[PDB]
Structure 1
């Protein structure tokens, strides 16, 4: 698209359509006030007793 009679740095643009899921790290903003859940993954490597 072309917008006539307009200067750079008077507008804002972003990419909005995504098809994949991302971990909700505290370093990224929330998508909406109340977030929706899509799935979960497990943490490997449990503890066990051994000898030294």
Structure 2
């Protein structure tokens, strides 16, 4: 059926007659940088000494 294009699949053999003949097509859903909404955190206490800090 020499009347069609197919993805260059490694699971399908190459056409024996034609050489390294190939085309290219744009694809949907490209990877893009966006924003993800999520959450945060907290803290603690503190005692002192000569040139020394102690945290629990």
Give the TM-score category using the shorter length. Answer: 0.3 to 0.5
Larger Rg: 1 or 2? 2
